[PDB]
Design a protein around this ligand. Structure first.
Ligand SMILES: CCCCCCCCCCCCCCCCCC(=O)OC[C@H](COP(=O)([O-])OCC(O)COP(=O)([O-])OC[C@@H](COC(=O)CCCCCCCCCCCCCCCCC)OC(=O)CCCCCCCCCCCCCCCCC)OC(=O)CCCCCCCCCCCCCCCCC
Ligand SMILES: CCCCCCCCCCCCCCCCCC(=O)OC[C@H](COP(=O)([O-])OCC(O)COP(=O)([O-])OC[C@@H](COC(=O)CCCCCCCCCCCCCCCCC)OC(=O)CCCCCCCCCCCCCCCCC)OC(=O)CCCCCCCCCCCCCCCCC
Ligand SMILES: CCCCCCCCCCCCCCCCCC(=O)OC[C@H](COP(=O)(O)OCCN)OC(=O)CCCCCCCCCCCCCCCCC
Ligand SMILES: CCCCCCCCCCCCCCCCCC(=O)OC[C@H](COP(=O)(O)OCCN)OC(=O)CCCCCCCCCCCCCCCCC
Ligand SMILES: CCCCCCCCCCCCCCCCCC(=O)OC[C@H](COP(=O)(O)OCCN)OC(=O)CCCCCCCCCCCCCCCCC
Ligand code: HEC
Ligand code: HEC
Ligand code: HEM
Ligand code: HEM
Ligand code: HEM
Ligand code: HEM
Ligand code: FES
Lengths: 80, 380, 241, 147, 380, 144
């Protein structure tokens, strides 16, 4: 019922493609991969990173608070 | 002549579901993960079958049979640690699959989503009983704790717990029936996954833009065939570097001791993928409150399609709800960390705040944010 | 006290990612277990035939197995009898049942050391720190008979007397048997006893890393072939105006 | 990779190390004195070994093949007639034969009275068949390898 | 609009398979039997699952666990004897289903017939290893005998039998892997039954006249719904009277003794549904020839669609081939009787003549009879 | 298992308490004897089957828990075996420790005739003939 031939109505659209044996599999891989990755990470880093930053701060604070919770209070054994 | 691929009644279903299936051209690597889950299921089943040819479900001999598998069966340690780390890989791929479904608005496929949350419940039950199966110290005490908190239901809870146990406590009958149930449930999971694929294939897949991708669809073969093969290879790389190099970084050492009913461990945990729910279960000082908190913490995914108040399906063009989503992932990681911690200061107040924030972000903050985002685009 | 002391990290010869065990150290640690540790501790899941091809030859392990006496039966009169041990025999029990261990060790049960570096946090570092960490208790805390202070044991009151000192045994290869050397050898032996597949696992991991380093860029290249037919596709909209 | 995975799983379905350890016996050696048979344990079954004299060899070889209940001579039961090796289970109800008893001077079962000769043949009794002889191997004479 | 039964994607499969499926009006009670098989399969699975809740696959405690099921578990004797007599009922229904397919010309549905032959092989293997599972005398000795006949294969047979055994004989590893395989094979049988129904619903079902029943077809609901419920209720009457009144008329008494490798039984037989194959194998005075005789007996049952040389489909109007068919069924009864008898006079010559007549009737006499009928009816 | 079938709770408890069974280990790991309880099984006469073979002239007396279901004829076979001890016919030579029983396969059983007239005294005053005792024990074995 839902196969190729009856998916959508498309008019006046031209597509050009070439054979995979005709073109390279890695056309300028590093020289255009690096700026594209940098663009994607600079468009998403402010939405993604600060929650995990404050997870790191909460994790370190909780671990150190537990460590000083196990620490001996020097105020005890001071009266006698 | 006759095209055999489109006419043979067994090859027609295989064609329509894997070869000539019209898939969106722009789906990212996250859409690999569900196929990985299926592969993981098969891997688990295969490894489970090769654990079943030597495992004995007797409390006198279960630990001895597991050690015999690890020490005397040829490459039996390999199959056992592949089974354990494949359960861990199953839950990693399951969590990322659910996160993809939450982020890209795929829950509007409501029947597929509900069959999914049924599959998630079945997989969690299977993994729990499987972890009980080696009959270590940790297995026995985890089963005892989970069933004891399951006894919190009024007027039927003690009877139901003694019915599940087959006795006064966790004993030989519990281990044998857990072996039977852990054997039989992954085939029900496979059948439910077939229903899951059918309910997806009535309407096609979603794309990361969330738009109607009918203008740009490609056949599943060879594009997503080779993409799924590459994802399978990467998942196998991570699974074998988990098995062959760090085989005990995810398990607990106390499971290598035999089950002592007289000796209790100083700190009782489930395995890591349950841990966040355990934190929610101990964020309320009431037994029924914690039990219902765990049940609604899993069932809030089923409640999720009724909370969508935005005119855009995906979160690609929705930055405020993106921020709320990553805060949700953040305090899910926080609840996972709290669930492995003992119950003292400040873990109690951190877990309580994390559970409150989890339920308030899913229930309250995301629909209000979607209303605000619709107001910003002059739509509301 | 409820406060715990973590053992430090020691530079083990098997600590590395592809680093196997030193088998002479496993042989020396088996000698340490046989002469010292076997009087109280058990090795129920380790047999003599596991030592063949690891520390000893077939005849050496056969002699080691036949040095001890194993209960066997039933005879044709229906009675038990002692026999010399063989390669299929497991390591002998110190006690017939754990209640005899409780009676002989002042109420304490010496655990089975077949998974003792797998069942403890720290692994062989914890075993080395426990064996080489016996010291005098500090002031304020006092301990009774049958108890010994050990800062690495949880609760700092272990029921095990210090079993290792300088020259507690004589090695077969003439190695000087100091306390640190004997503890290192027995920790290596216990690491092998918990993980007998360790060297084979690391060899498999090395072959896996080489095969994945070969296969991942090639499968990536096949994917980018079959997808670079699509990733250079160009579109054009030509409405008739 | 597929070869190694399939081969490892198939080898996992094969015999384990403890089964391969229990299959081979320790060295029987030449501890057997003249006339006496001794019994070891092998695969949950008794195993009788005995030194044999030439007069007993000819006395067992005097009995023909086809005239008995089962056709089997003395010459094909053992490779070297100096020693006789057999599984010490009576084949009627699974009892143990008594060493050096019966009218033929071989074995006798106290359960229901089956007379066995020096070669393990049945001649008098309700046993439906003989006592089976395992397939052993002859190394240098200090070691015989059965199993 | 609201015709959910034919618009819901899950519900339309059940509709198309069981409610609006066009079935021939004139099919007799024989067409009930396959549906009974599916129900009987479900019964086996359910009873087996509860039998898996208390059974241990250890050679020191398998018999003890069976006695503990029969004595201490509440209605455990009922579950065990329903499982055993349901295996017998399953093979009765298989024999009648196969006989219907042979008589009424249903083998011309070739894919359905071949999937059936695979199903029959899987069910026979499952029942064999399940009979090995209680670890009585007859279980151990039948497993030893059948594996020795497997070892009759030249140059690969002995290594294959020691690979299947996991050692030198039938032992601990054989029993545990037989429990694993006996658990896992009925789910593959259920999947192959789904493929069976898929191919049959692709081609439609046959009627006793062998004619095109497209002119007179009725919905499956409620006619064959109430007819198969009547058949299920009759089958449950026979199964429950076999369980509650004569529990041991089909079983063997020597399986109530523990397995003794020292003591061999005076006469070793398999169960009654393997006795005709045992008599076929035992008649030829060779090992490899007998194993090939058993395999090629079930394989000429598979080869049956290539021997049909008649212009009519069913045997309703073919009296000579009817006589030959009833002689064949009579010969199968004789072979089943001979398979339970020891090898003395005249059972060897009776079994030899029975097997020779069986292969001669299937391979030679039936197509010659069909050609004679085509001559007599003036077809050509 | 005898409660609610043949005996009451106190009767079966007295039956259990009149025999001494094996218990252990204690606090110092030593086996010791104790009075029997209701959950205790029926005591074995021998610790291992080789001791049974040594005590019973090579022969092993089988466990009679399924001896009705493991023999052809059921309790008819047990009743015919217990009441069917007869003198051997001519031409049959019988060794020591063996007894002629035509219902036994091979007609040479290693069990001496275990029941006779007044072989025990019944609690209910039933006369203990050989046939009555054999019928009672065959009914008990069918129940077992
Ligand atoms: C960074 C330096 C290199 C660089 O610039 O690369 C650019 C390149 C991106 O180039 P682009 O032109 O901007 O994007 C088009 C893609 O190359 C088009 O390729 P793609 O990224 O869509 O490929 C499909 C995807 C398929 O990925 C999957 O299937 C992943 C499956 C999920 C992960 C495994 C499951 C378990 C997870 C546990 C947690 O593969 C990847 O993402 C990378 C596969 C690397 C294989 C090994 C290569 C050595 O970066 C990468 O591909 C990143 C990975 C390699 C570095
Ligand atoms: C003198 C002999 C008896 C004569 C007599 O009563 O004739 C009346 C009557 C004469 O039949 P009719 O009027 O010539 O035509 C039959 C009807 O049109 C339609 O009747 P029908 O027989 O085709 O009924 C459907 C068929 C449906 O059959 C089934 O559902 C059975 C399917 C096979 C079950 C096999 C279980 C496993 C077997 C292992 C061996 O039921 C039967 O074959 C028997 C039903 C018995 C119901 C309970 C009666 C009490 O006899 C019967 O209907 C036969 C059953 C009598 C009971
Ligand atoms: C880790 C890195 C994630 C990351 O890079 O996220 C940003 C990425 C942006 O993708 P998108 O917003 O679709 O836009 C494409 C670029 N214009 O967005 C994505 O890649 C979207 C990722 C969606 C799935 C994330 C799952 C994270 C784990 C969730 C676990 C818990 C799930 C809920 C359990 C209850
Ligand atoms: C279903 C999926 C099962 C898991 C798939 C990966 C298994 C990897 C693995 O464990 O490989 C082990 C194998 C070690 O080979 P080895 O035993 O040393 O013998 C080689 C010939 N003597 O290692 C190898 O053969 C090389 C590693 C192959 C890794 C997979 C590559 C795809
Ligand atoms: C069975 C007992 C006899 C049943 C009986 O009366 O059969 C006669 C019946 C006649 O049916 P028909 O020729 O169609 O005439 C209808 C016209 N009133 O004819 C039939 O019902 C024929 C169909 C009978 C099918 C079952 C009998 C054979 C069962 C064993 C088959 C074994 C096949 C091989 C298995 C191992 C390989
Ligand atoms: C008899 C005097 C013993 C000798 C000889 C050895 N051990 Fe022992 N050990 C003994 C007891 C009574 C106990 C339990 C004490 C308690 O308070 O629990 C132990 C314990 C250990 C442990 C476990 C430590 C833990 O954290 O549970 C280890 C790892 C251990 N012992 C090591 C060990 C080694 C390596 C020995 C040979 C040199 C050895 N022990 C000898 C009693 C005795
Ligand atoms: C010691 C003298 C015994 C007494 C008292 C009882 N039985 Fe026995 N029994 C004994 C032996 C040594 C054997 C095996 C002998 C042999 O030739 O195999 C048996 C055997 C039986 C059997 C099994 C018969 C069979 O066909 O396998 C039965 C059913 C049996 N005995 C019954 C039985 C009953 C009911 C007894 C109480 C009256 C009884 N026996 C006492 C030794 C002894
Ligand atoms: C039908 C297929 C399966 C079978 C037959 C099976 C069988 C077994 C057996 C026998 C064990 C005990 C051996 C051991 O200790 O590892 C086991 C353990 C386990 N199984 Fe499975 N299993 C199956 C599928 C799964 C699946 C799908 C999961 C994941 C949800 C899973 C999760 C586990 C876990 C976590 C353990 C504990 C491993 C450990 O000891 O650490 N199993 N399984
Ligand atoms: C048992 C584990 C699971 C398996 C094997 C599984 C299998 C699959 C497969 C094969 C797909 C199609 C490929 C893809 O889009 O990734 C898919 C898609 C999907 N699954 Fe699952 N799934 C599982 C768990 C879940 C769960 C728990 C949910 C619910 C949260 C879920 C909801 C979905 C949705 C919504 C899609 C559609 C993806 C889209 O179009 O965006 N699945 N699943
Ligand atoms: C997956 C579902 C099944 C499971 C879990 C299962 C499990 C078991 C178990 C545990 C036993 C041993 C208990 C006993 O001896 O009665 C057993 C026995 C047996 N099973 Fe199954 N079974 C299953 C399906 C089947 C099927 C489909 C057949 C064939 C019709 C079958 C035939 C048998 C037979 C013949 C026995 C021996 C009965 C006896 O002698 O006591 N089983 N099964
Ligand atoms: C595993 C057991 C089996 C099950 C559950 C099963 C199931 C079914 C079902 C539900 C039907 C449709 C209803 C009917 O016509 O009776 C059917 C028909 C059929 N089956 Fe099976 N079957 C089994 C075994 C076999 C075998 C062993 C064969 C091959 C000899 C076979 C060949 C056929 C054929 C030819 C039909 C068509 C009947 C006709 O239209 O005349 N089946 N089966
Ligand atoms: S058992 Fe040996 S003579 Fe019968």
């Amino acid at each position: 019922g839902r196969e190729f031939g009856n998916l959508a109505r498309i008019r006046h659209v031209i597509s050009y493609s070439l054979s995979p044996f005709e073109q390279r599999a890695f056309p300028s891989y590093f020289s255009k991969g690096i700026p594209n990755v940098l663009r994607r990470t600079r468009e998403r880093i402010l939405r993604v990173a600060p929650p995990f930053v404050v997870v790191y701060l909460i994790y370190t604070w909780g671990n150190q608070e537990f460590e000083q919770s196990k620490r001996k209070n020097p105020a005890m054994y001071e009266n006698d | 002549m006759t095209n055999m691929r489109k006419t043979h009644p067994l090859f027609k279903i295989i064609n329509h579901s894997f070869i000539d299936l019209p898939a969106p051209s722009n789906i990212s690597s996250w859409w690999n993960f569900g196929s990985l889950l299926g592969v993981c299921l098969m891997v688990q089943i295969i490894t489970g079958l090769f654990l079943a040819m030597h495992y004995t479900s007797d409390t006198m001999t279960a630990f001895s049979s597991v050690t015999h598998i690890c020490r005397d069966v040829n490459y039996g340690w390999l199959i056992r640690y592949m089974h354990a780390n494949g359960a861990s890989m199953f839950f990693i791929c399951l969590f990322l699959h659910v996160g993809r479904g939450l982020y890209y608005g795929s829950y509007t496929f409501m029947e597929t989503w509900n069959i999914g949350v049924l599959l998630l419940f079945a997989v969690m039950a299977t993994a729990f009983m499987g972890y009980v199966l080696p009959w270590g110290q940790m297995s026995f005490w985890g089963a005892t704790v989970i069933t004891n908190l399951l006894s919190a239901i009024p007027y039927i809870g003690t009877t139901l717990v003694e019915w599940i146990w087959g006795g006064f406590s966790v004993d030989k009958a519990t281990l044998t029936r857990f072996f039977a149930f852990h054997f039989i449930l992954p085939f029900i999971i496979a059948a439910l996954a077939i229903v899951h694929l059918l309910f997806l294939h009535e309407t096609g897949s979603n794309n990361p833009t969330g738009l109607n991708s009918d203008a740009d669809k490609i056949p599943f073969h060879p594009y997503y065939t080779i993409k799924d093969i590459l994802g399978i290879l990467i998942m196998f790389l991570i699974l074998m570097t988990l098995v062959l190099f760090f085989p005990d970084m995810l398990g607990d050492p106390d499971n290598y001791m035999p089950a002592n009913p007289l000796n209790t461990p100083p700190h009782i945990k489930p395995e890591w993928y349950f841990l966040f729910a355990y934190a929610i279960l101990r964020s309320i000082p009431n037994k029924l409150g914690g039990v219902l908190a765990l049940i609604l913490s899993i069932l809030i995914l089923a409640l999720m399609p009724f909370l969508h108040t935005s005119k855009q399906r995906s979160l690609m063009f929705r930055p405020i709800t993106q921020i709320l989503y990553w805060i949700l992932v953040a305090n899910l990681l926080i609840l996972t960390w709290i669930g492995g911690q003992p119950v003292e200061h400040p873990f109690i107040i951190i877990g309580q705040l994390a559970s409150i924030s989890y339920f308030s972000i899913i229930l309250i903050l995301m629909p209000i944010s979607g209303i605000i985002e619709d107001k910003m685009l002059k739509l509301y | 006290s409820d406060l715990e002391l973590h053992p430090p990290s020691y530079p083990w010869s098997h600590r590395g990612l592809l680093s196997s065990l030193d088998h002479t150290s496993i042989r020396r640690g088996f000698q340490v277990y046989k002469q010292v540790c076997s009087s109280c501790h058990s090795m129920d899941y380790v047999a003599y035939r596991h030592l063949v091809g690891v520390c000893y030859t077939e005849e050496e392990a056969k002699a080691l197995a036949e040095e001890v006496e194993v209960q066997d039966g039933p005879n044709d009169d229906g009675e038990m009898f002692m026999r010399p041990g063989k390669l299929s025999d497991y390591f002998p029990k110190p006690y017939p049942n754990p209640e005899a261990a409780r009676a002989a060790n002042n109420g304490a049960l010496p655990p089975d050391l077949s998974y003792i570096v797998r069942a403890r946090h720290g692994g062989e570092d914890y075993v080395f720190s426990l064996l080489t960490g016996y010291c005098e208790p500090p002031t304020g805390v006092s301990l009774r008979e049958g108890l010994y202070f050990n800062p690495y044991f949880p609760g700092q009151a272990i029921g095990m007397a210090p079993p290792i000192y300088t020259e507690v045994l004589e090695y077969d290869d003439g190695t000087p048997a100091t306390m640190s050397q004997v503890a290192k050898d027995v920790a290596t032996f216990l690491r092998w006893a918990s993980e007998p597949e360790h060297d084979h696992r690391k060899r498999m991991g090395l072959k896996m890393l080489l095969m994945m380093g070969l296969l991942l860029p090639l499968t990536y290249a096949m994917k980018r072939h079959k997808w670079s037919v699509l990733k250079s596709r160009k579109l054009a909209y030509r409405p008739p105006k | 990779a597929a070869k190694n995975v399939v081969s490892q799983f198939v080898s996992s379905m094969s015999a384990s190390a403890d089964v391969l350890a229990m299959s081979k016996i320790e060295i029987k050696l030449s501890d057997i004195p003249e006339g006496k048979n001794m019994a070891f344990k092998w695969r949950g079954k008794p195993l009788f070994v005995r030194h044999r004299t030439k007069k007993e060899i000819d006395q067992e070889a005097a009995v023909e093949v086809s005239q008995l209940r089962d056709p089997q001579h003395d010459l094909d039961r053992v490779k070297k007639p100096e020693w006789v090796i057999l599984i010490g289970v009576c084949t009627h109800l699974g009892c143990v034969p008594i060493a050096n008893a019966g009218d033929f001077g071989g074995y006798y079962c106290p359960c229901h009275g089956s007379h066995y000769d020096a070669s393990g043949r049945i001649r008098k009794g309700p046993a439906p068949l003989n006592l089976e002889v395992p397939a052993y191997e002859f190394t240098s004479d200090d070691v015989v390898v059965v199993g």
